Structures are given as C-alpha cells and as structure tokens.
Structure 1
Amino acid sequence: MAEAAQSVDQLIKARGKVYFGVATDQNRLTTGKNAAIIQADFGMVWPENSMQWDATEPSQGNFNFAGADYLVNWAQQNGKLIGGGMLVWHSQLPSWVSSITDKNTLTNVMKNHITTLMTRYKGKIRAWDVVGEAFNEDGSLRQTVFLNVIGEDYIPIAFQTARAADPNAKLYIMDYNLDSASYPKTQAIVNRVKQWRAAGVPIDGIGSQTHLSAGQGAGVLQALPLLASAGTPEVSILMLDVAGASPTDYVNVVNACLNVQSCVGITVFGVADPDSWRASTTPLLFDGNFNPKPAYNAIVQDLQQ
C-alpha cells in the first residue's frame, strides 16, 4: 500500500543544499512507518526531546544519554546526518538549574552541560542548537534563569564553550516567530547576532523555528533574506510545520531557502500528521496513513532540475 515517491532530501542536495531533515526520537522510530519514511525521504534527523536538559541531566552531574544514544546510533546505522539540542533553553529545564542564583555557579553548570553533551558525540553531529528561544516578542532578551543570573554574557559564553567542545559542529542560535521581516523580533535577532559576531561570538547559524499558520509561507520569502543579513555562515528552517499543509505555503518556504545562499536546509517537525503537536491542523507532509500529502509532492515538483 506504500505509495511511489521521490526523496526531497536527494532533490534538495541536487539543488545545492545540505539536507532535508526531520525531527524524531526513539518512540517514533519504533512505530508506524516513521523509520521507513525517514530512510527513504529525509537525510538528517534531530532529537525532538532526547537531548533536552531535562532528559540528559536530570540532576547536576548525573547524565542520561540512553535516548540520545538511540537516535545517534540509528542515524549512523542509517546513513543520516544528526542535529542536536537544545543545549541552553528555559523550557524543559530541571528545577535544580532554576534553583541556582550564583553567577559563577550557573556559568560552570551551563558550560559543563554544553561540553559533556557535545564531547560525547564529537565529530558526529552536523549542528547544535546552542541557545534557543532567547528573545521576547518585542526583541528584548527573554528573562530566563540564564539571563537573570549570568546576564547577557551567557550567550557569548555558551557559544565559546561549544566551539571548544566540538570545533567541527555548526553552532546555531534558534528562535520562533521569525517568519515576517516586519516583526520586531526578526529585526532584533539580526541586530544582536551582528553585534555578537563583532564581539567574536562563534554563532555559525540562525535557525528559524517556522511554525506557520495558513498563508504565512509567503512571508518567509522576505524574513529569511533578512535573517541572512546578520552575516552568519548559515541559516536554516527548523521545526517546520504549516496549519493546513497547503502546497503553496510549503513551496514558498522551500523557495525561501533556495533563494538564500547561506540557507543549508530545511527540517520538518515530524513525519505524520497524527503525531504533531498541532495534529488537528494536519500540518506535516505525510498523512495518518504515512502517505505523502499534496504538499510533499508539490515540494518534489518544485525541486526537480
């Protein structure tokens, strides 16, 4: 009953991009047709939760890598690239980290978390989301424990530490609602990343978590070039999904990446609609029967060359 298809990963590489990827983890790989679809159609996998802080360091200095190892091992078995993260994020943070008020203590904790995770997989990981969701909607920095205890230097320090732990990895800052050039948040992240790179922070990429509502794909055609103007080596579309999964929206986002030389690829936030955090809007590229949806076939048509 499986349908004939083409790999969007193979097609996007033929157009000069690095990958078309997907978020997943052990329980998805064990169920449905996820592993088979990822094997056939996607070239990079990202851990949805198994590399988050609550999963990997549930108490200080006590690391748990079972779920992360599963994904890394599966990807290597199956010839897939691997992305990791998020290393520094206020969500899915254990309470013991929020307990800390001493600046030097939290710095050491953050640096240890980054170094331990990145060293375990040194040379194996294409890219790490070093800092995620650091900005408020108005463009100011989000008042997380890291900002409140360490200050603004937590971002410089996090990236310097990551570069040392694995110099081969691409180091990303990531955020959401960067989907319109008109947003104060989009302009602010660009301004701050330019200034951070002038301060020597090794921010290799900006990753735009592109959770779109219907019709918002068109806006990414202007938002992504604006993000590229920060001058980072790379940008990327991360955690893509689209309410309604209209082919027009999905093709607009793909074309945004094709239009930007620093865009290295696109990652979709899961395989099949029923597993989406917004499943009721059927926002992914495969349906509940694990068959490719019209948007998948529209991407395929757009990437033919």
Structure 2
Amino acid sequence: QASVSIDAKFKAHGKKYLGTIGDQYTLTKNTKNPAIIKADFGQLTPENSMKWDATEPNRGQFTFSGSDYLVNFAQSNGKLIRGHTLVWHSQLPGWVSSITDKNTLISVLKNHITTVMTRYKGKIYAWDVLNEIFNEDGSLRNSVFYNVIGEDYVRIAFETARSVDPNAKLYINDYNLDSAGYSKVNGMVSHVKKWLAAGIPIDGIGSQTHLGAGAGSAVAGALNALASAGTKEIAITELDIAGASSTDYVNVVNACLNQAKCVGITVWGVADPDSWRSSSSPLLFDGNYNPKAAYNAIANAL
C-alpha cells in the first residue's frame, strides 16, 4: 500500500473515484494486492466475473460465485462498483451467438440483463450495459445482437437496464476513443446524440483508454469530444499505458481532472504481473507490488 492515496487526492478535486479492478484470485494471491486496493483506490470493476461467459454459461442457468465475491469485497470495504459487462460480442457463450430468431434473442438478452442486474440491485454505481459495439470507422459492429435484432438492441438493452435498477448509471463502453477527430470517436458521438434524442437512457460513455507509450497527451481532447455527445457523465474505464511513464499517466489524469463530465478513472489492474498486457509493464505498481514512479507523479499532480 502506498502511504498517499491517489483516490483520496482525486476525490479532493470533486471527482467520484480513482479505482482499479479485481476478482477472487488477485484479491487473495498475496497480502499486498488487497491491501493496496483498500488503501489507494476507491472503486472496483470485476475483471471477468460479471461477463456473460462467467454468469450465464448455459441458457437460463446462472453462476454467480465469482461476482458475489467481488461485490461482497467491495461493499465490505467501502468501494464503489462498476458492473462489467452486460452485452458484449467477446466472452459470449456459443449458445447466445447461435440464436437466429429475433424474438428469442431479445428474450434471452432481457433475461440476462434482468437476472444479473437484479442480483446486485442498488449496489452498483455504474453498469457497462454495452461493450465495444463499434467498428473502428464508427459504424455498428456486426455482432450477433446487431445481426439478429438490428440497431434496436441498443434501445432494448438500456431500457431494460433502466427499469431493473434505476439507481445505476447506464454506460456504453469502448476502446480507441483516445483522440479527437478519430472516426470511432465521431461515430460514438453521433450515435449517442441520436440515441439520446430518441429517449434511450444512456447516462454515460466509458472510454477504456488502453494506451501505448506517448498517447497520453491526446486523451484530453478525446474526452472533450466525447462530452459533446450529451450524456450526463463520461469516465476512463480501463486505463493502462505501455511503459507506464509519469508524463503519460499524469497527462491522462489531468485529462479527466479538467473535464467536468469525467467522474472518475479506473486503472485496469493494480500490479504489472497481473496485467492482461503484463509484457508492457503498463500499471502503477510493479512486480513487487510497490508504487512505481508514475503513481507518485499522479499523487504529486493532485
């Protein structure tokens, strides 16, 4: 645990949280990891336990062991929770993707959203309702949901989520929304404006922010562009930067700090060895679960 909490310092600026991720394994693999989570971060996103493959492996049969543990740990330690993720083309069981009847898929979709959301009703700050539904050029990704139901699945997902748990912030999350002017950013913006004008309950846009070295400086403009979509809030949902330079990390933190709609930042992992991009050492804590230079840089910038 780092003596100075970047979550505390970020919150001091009126932000909601500076959080990270976890699940049973990383929360119990050693003593430093859960200790770091409790001392320096204020929000948790389950890395894998709330995904479709882990929650509904078979049609209508739910498995909530992992997700229960994550939610219970967070709730037991005063950490906000971001549910992730309800509708996604990746980590989706074959039984879902093989469905070809529109009404059958809508039924399945609604039951999945309803069961997962109902189980944690009132305990979730934000839900990534839809994840990665855009192609790089801004067009809608041809996933089973898009292919079988059509663009209306967007309305259905958000409306179902809104009625199931009106207390959770409903988000659409995506990656590569990292620079103003990028096609995917333009597509995210124009579509959300359209959906909001039609009455679709979208509370926020989540920008993953999986960066390469040097890409930190363009994030401020990207967030400014995303703010034009018209949602109530936006957030950096899965931050990690290859090389973990102080300049990149501080640039990204300032990007959120200086944009009124950015409620918080979630770093996709605590320590490098547990990163899904471990070979690029993209996190704030190193192989010894000790704060890296960037962590202190972030603290001294707040």
Counterpart in 2 of 1:220? 219
Counterpart in 2 of 1:193? 192
Residue type of the partner of 2:8?
Q
Counterpart in 1 of 2:99? 100
What are the within-5 Å matches in structure 2 for residues 162-173 of structure 1? 162-173=161-172
Q: CA deviation at 1:31?
A: 1.0
Counterpart in 2 of 1:12? 10
Moved over 3 A (4+): none
Counterpart in 1 of 2:131? 132
Q: CA deviation at 1:78?
A: 1.0
Distance 1:84 1:282 in 2: 26
Q: CA deviation at 1:5?
A: 2.5
Residue type of the partner of 2:12?
A
Q: Number of paired residues? A: 301
Q: Is 64-73 or 24-33 further displaced after alignment? A: 24-33
Distance 1:86 1:79 in 2: 21
Secondary structure in 2 matching 1:301:
helix
Q: CA deviation at 1:182?
A: 2.3
How much is the aligned-residue C-alpha RMSD, in angstroms? 0.8
Q: CA deviation at 1:207?
A: 0.3
Distance 1:188 1:5 in 2: 42
Secondary structure in 1 matching 2:172:
strand
1:113 matches 2:112: yes
Q: CA deviation at 1:99?
A: 1.1
Distance 1:266 1:139 in 2: 24
Counterpart in 2 of 1:161? 160
Secondary structure in 2 matching 1:20:
strand
Q: CA deviation at 1:277?
A: 1.5
Distance 1:27 1:278 in 2: 17
Deviation by residue 1:65-113 (Cα, 9 ceiling, x = unmatched):
0000000111111111111011000000000001100001101111110
Calculate percent identity across the aligned residue pairs. 70
Counterpart in 2 of 1:243? 242
Counterpart in 2 of 1:210? 209
Distance 1:275 1:120 in 2: 28
Counterpart in 1 of 2:28? 30
Deviation by residue 1:135-154 (Cα, 9 ceiling, x = unmatched):
00011000000000000000
Counterpart in 1 of 2:175? 176
Structure 2 alignment gaps of length 5 or more: none
Distance 1:23 1:195 in 2: 32
Distance 1:23 1:224 in 2: 22
Deviation by residue 1:223-277 (Cα, 9 ceiling, x = unmatched):
0110011110110001100000010111111111011111000000000001112
Residue type of the partner of 2:194?
Q
Query: How does the TM-score come out when normalised to structure 2?
Result: 0.98
Deviation by residue 1:20-73 (Cα, 9 ceiling, x = unmatched):
110111110011221000000000000010000000000111001000000011
Structure 1 alignment gaps of length 5 or more: none
Distance 1:38 1:16 in 2: 20
Deviation by residue 1:194-246 (Cα, 9 ceiling, x = unmatched):
11000000110000010000100000010011001111011000110000001
Residue type of the partner of 1:257?
C
Distance 2:175 2:283 in 1: 17
Deviation by residue 1:273-297 (Cα, 9 ceiling, x = unmatched):
0111211111000001111111000
Distance 1:242 1:136 in 2: 22
Residue type of the partner of 2:186?
Q
Distance 1:75 1:89 in 2: 24
Distance 1:185 1:202 in 2: 21
